[PDB]
Amino acid sequence: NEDYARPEWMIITVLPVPPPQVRPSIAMDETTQGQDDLTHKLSDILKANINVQKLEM
Amino acid sequence: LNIRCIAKKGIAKEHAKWSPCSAIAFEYDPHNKLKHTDFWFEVDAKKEWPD
Amino acid sequence: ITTEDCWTVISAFFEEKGLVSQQLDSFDEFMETSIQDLVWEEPRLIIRFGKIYLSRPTMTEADGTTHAMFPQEARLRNLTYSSPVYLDMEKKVHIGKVPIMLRSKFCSLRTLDEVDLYKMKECPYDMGGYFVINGSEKVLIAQESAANIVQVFKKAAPSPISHVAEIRSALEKGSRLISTMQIKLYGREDKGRTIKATLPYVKQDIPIVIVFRALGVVPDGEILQHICYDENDWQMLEMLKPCIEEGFVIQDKEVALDFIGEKRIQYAKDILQKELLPHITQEEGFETRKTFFLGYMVNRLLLCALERKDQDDRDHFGKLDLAGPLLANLFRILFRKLTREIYRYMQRCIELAVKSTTITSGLKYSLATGNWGEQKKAMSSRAGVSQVLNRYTYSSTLSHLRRTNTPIAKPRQLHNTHWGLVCPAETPEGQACGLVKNLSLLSGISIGSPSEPIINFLEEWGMEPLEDYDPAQHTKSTRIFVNGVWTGIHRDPSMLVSTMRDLRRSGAISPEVSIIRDIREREFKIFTDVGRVYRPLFIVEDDESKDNELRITKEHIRKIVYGWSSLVTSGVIEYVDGEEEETIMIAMTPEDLDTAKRIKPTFTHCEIHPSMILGVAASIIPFPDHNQSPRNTYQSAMGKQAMGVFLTNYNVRMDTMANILYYPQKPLAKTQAMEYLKFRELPAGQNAIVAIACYSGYNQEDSMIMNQSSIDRGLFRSLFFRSYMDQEKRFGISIVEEFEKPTRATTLRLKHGTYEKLDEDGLIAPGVRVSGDDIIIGKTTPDASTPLRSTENGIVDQVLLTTNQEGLKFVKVRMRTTKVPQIGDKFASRHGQKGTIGVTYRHEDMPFSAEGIVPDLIINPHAIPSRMTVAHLIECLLSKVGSIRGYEGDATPFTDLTVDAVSNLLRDNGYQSRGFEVMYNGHTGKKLMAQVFFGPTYYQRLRHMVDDKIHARARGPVQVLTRQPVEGRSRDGGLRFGEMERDCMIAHGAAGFLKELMEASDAFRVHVCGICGLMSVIANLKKNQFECRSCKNKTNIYQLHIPYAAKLLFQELMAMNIAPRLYTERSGVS
Amino acid sequence: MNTSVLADEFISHRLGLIPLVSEDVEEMKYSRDCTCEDYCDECSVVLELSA
Amino acid sequence: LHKMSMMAHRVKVMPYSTFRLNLSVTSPYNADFDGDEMNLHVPQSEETRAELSQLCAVPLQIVSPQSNKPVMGIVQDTLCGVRKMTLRDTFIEYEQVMNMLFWVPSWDGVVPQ
Amino acid sequence: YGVKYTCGACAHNFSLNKSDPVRCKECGHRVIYKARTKRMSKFLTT
Amino acid sequence: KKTVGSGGGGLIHTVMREKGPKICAELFGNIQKVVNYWLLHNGFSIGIGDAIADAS
Amino acid sequence: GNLMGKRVFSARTVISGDPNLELDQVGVPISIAKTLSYPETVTQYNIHRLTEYVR
Amino acid sequence: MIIPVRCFSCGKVVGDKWDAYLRLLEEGKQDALDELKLKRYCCRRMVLTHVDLIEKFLRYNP
Ligand SMILES: [Zn+2]
Ligand SMILES: [Zn+2]
């Protein structure tokens, strides 16, 4: 469907990053970490993106 | 072991620790004449049921 | 020897083995021996290992030397009851801390006597057998298809295969491969029928002929030599014919090992000396032997495809890895990572290192959780092994230790083979039922003897070795097997048999080994194995040159320096495993083998006592031989849930939750077996003055009436303990926590309740009466204070400060409470006759009998007819006599006591011969037109009191991700309105109410875009500003009400790139 | 003070049951009717116990 | 698994920690008192309530559509006894025939000949 | 008059505060209970 | 059971149909209250004795 | 898990039948009634009673 | 776990009777209950079933 979903968009160019209520953090009072699962494979991806570009310049 | 107790009036309703009774026998018309009962039995009520 | 005699024998048994033999026996076997063989095998490194040292309990803490540790402490301080391991390494050395097994050998308890223990605060009655990791008591659970055996299965009409024979093989000691042999048989029962077999690592399958030539047999008929043992059996031979043709194309050992794909030929060998039927041996010059097997196999196949032998019985029980073994397969996995670890330090030194923490911490992980297999990205293990030892009641703990598992309609069954070894009744309802078995009283598990002292002892008493065999000179040659290996045959065996059997009885071939002679097939079974359940029996032997008789006599009995070890060293009793059982004949009643008793209908052994086929559970059930079996099975479970005394040291125990029945009471009726279940000294209940009748109609539908008056005199009251515990965490980076009485001070992070009952040490005193939420402990983080669970309250009962290995401040608190029986609490007898309280009347209101005597309990006559549990009815009668007579009333299983008898004994005392008594209605005093079954019966006060369940919520703590309520009553949760509840409302056409998923849960106001139907809108709710740049709007916007779970459904879908557009108007029409 | 192996309220129970004299029990008043905050000689009996 | 596994009841606040339900309404939920627990939900709108009382009231449920017959009768004690009380041999005298009529709330206030 | 902590075995009234170690006037055994309260506890006879 | 059970002819089934949800719903409590009360006084029980067979 | 069915003004405890409760009643432990509420709008018919219940 | 003052069932005292009983056994070698005045089984079962744990508890140190 030319308007709502064109064949091409099945490949992602720019990745939609979902917000906090989605991947909430759970701190252990104040001075302790606590981060969601997704709030990681977002960062794992982010990092796998950074290095890539820094190999193409 | 050091205590200090305080006793009070009260009755068995409020608590069993009160009632001075403790078991009380009651029976009437040992020979079932009033027929306020129907004896269980296999053959003979009278012989099988303690007098 | 009469019946009443066999009891002393049994007494003799536990005097020496004790309820938890298995556990300990199997542990020592790992320490003592096993542990050595494991460290000494594929050790030596391109540096070798020798004897290993196993010291007693120690505590290596910084700020102190090495304190010689004890059970009761590690318990309180949450430590680890383990000791050191040293090994004489070659170019003395420390390698890990091994968690010892309480009551074992390295556990100091093993020696200390009565008085000795009372001083270690350790309850004498504690039979031990468990480990104490990081505090909590962990119990290793037995893990139950045997190995190294030939099986033949028919495979369904739809399949290129007709029949197939398999044999699962694994080295009883050494790595232990799990690769099976498949000797198929293609060609269904028609088509013009080859035989091919599967080998480990080989892509396709090979036609048996080749497997032989590739083995060392190159000519035909010399191949048929091995398979068939009777040249005059043309049928079988015929079958083989087509097969020979298959391999007719490969005529020698060269090609033989080839077709298996110089480079390739060499590998061929390998898969035959280390993979092919790897048991037997993976040596080299034994090719011959394996060949006779593959021959005995191809034989077994056909023996069936020709209707001469049935398909193998998959569930023939005769065909249990306790604690000791488990540590084994576990240790190896560990020590082996240490092995190749020590290999790296040696692979860097271009010219100490051994991190003895992998064997200490590795062991802990498993034993702590229940996941055997390592940790790492390897969850591909099994959880269950090692649990949290029960402590509800004594009979609860016993049961727990004597437990078995079984990884997942036929297995759950109570097989025949199960007789004697496992208890028929005790086994969990629902879910896993039959996958969890408990041991009988007499059962024990094998441990692991040595083969050779019997292999030798054989090939020197008639065993002409297999190596050189001739099928025709030796026709009906009885072949013999050793632990699943074929060590040659034997000529006349009748004697070989009654010699080994005489050898065991003097005690020169461990009473634990199994020897089975199957004349009906001509074979000799030899078993040393570790994990074979066995029971003990009296030997019969027609050894009476004075008649026709139990070797044991009334002289041996009254003679009981005469243990159970002697009852065995004289050949008066034997240890019969399930396999050997097959070929013996057991007599029930020793003796024997009235219009009241139950009608009763070559011997080699007699039964110590039938009432021994029961395990801990049923052993406490009175007349289990009088109730509907499925009921006994229930009580078999509720017992592990009654109240009592689980130890005596309890007053010095800091465990979360524990209940003690104010005043116990050994039952008015008992099992002779109870005597070994220390039950009389640690009862699970009290003897209540029962009264089975209808009254207010509040004893209806399994709800019972309990006499308040006596509930006051303390009947069925119980103490309840609890222990909240905390630590003071630190960081290698000197930043420590605190135990104080915090207030204000820049943070606010505090609780709602009060801290005032907190002395300045951040603790309460043991006198304090705490309640509601009152802060029990005070900790801070430069609040982390602990609050009494919201539903609870009571009084502090004992506070204690302590060190941690890391010199941290350890503090546990214990709170007590007396719990009174209430109009809702659950109870039950020992007959699946469970019921809860419906109301509570007093003495007046209560119905009564002339004597005065009044019931404590009134259960409904209706809980009898369909439950069928009659023994219940009997225990009452009997116990009403034992009440009056002062003599203990025996209810024990299959004895010589009858309902007709007891009834006569009750008539001698004064009351109706059947129990029934006259009663006068407590309200009016007028007699009851009927009579009642009034009589003392034992009743266990199962845990599960109302006030621990009663829960009600209205808008409480909401979840984060979903925004729906939260789970569980403890965290103030809310009951779920799951699917099924949905359905109903929909059936009712209760449209609105159901819609009312929103009001009672989620709900939420999201702002959609009138154009790109999304939850984008930047709604700054005040200055009205709405917007949604990207779609640049501020004019067309809608607000909607949906379940946040759903709002989330969408945000989620989006981040996965799918777009859930929300539109407020239908455009598509219809 | 209490170092007994029995708990506080366990003993407390016990004493509730211990039978006390109640002869002239009728010439005493229920703590509920007595105008004294808590208790007194006119409506209670105090006891000591040291062991 | 029933339309009747959920029914609207008249609330009666009572003491003691437990939901006290009538016997005859036992088999619909299929409960017993050996420990069985029950969930309770509270309507919130004026209609929500109505919808609960006009279609889910226990009285409306007495005749089950699945088997076109009622689905709640007289169980245990009440049944068992109602039998006895019926036999020609069962007789009651004035003193009790009175305390019995009293227990019937709708009693017209007239003792039958 | 006065008591703070006790020992699991040699019940000898101790008394301490932060950093003063967590042992006893002899027995190394580092347990210790926090002795009863001063404020009397009142009970009911039922 | 036959005359007052969750059965077809059921006096209940009939009272529901003839009088209504309400009237019949009350009917229970009554038939109950009278009977339960009565039983409270006439008593009823069961014991091993109910399970033994004649001598011959 | 969260949409076709969610946890939801609800309570649950142990049942025991009562032979003195109209067929359609259901005895609720005071405790519970004092926990579960019901939003009743103020109206000149119930103001009087509500202002009492509130005090 | 100590002796129960007064019998649950009927109420008759029974605290004192413990030592009397546990004595009429050891020595007089004896029925005991009957002379101790414990008639009907309600109180009977009380004594005849008590398992005095307190003894073992008492065997503990501090
Ligand atoms: Zn838009
Ligand atoms: Zn006063």
Ligand SMILES: [Zn+2]
């Ligand atoms: Zn000390």
Ligand SMILES: [Zn+2]
């Ligand atoms: Zn008594």
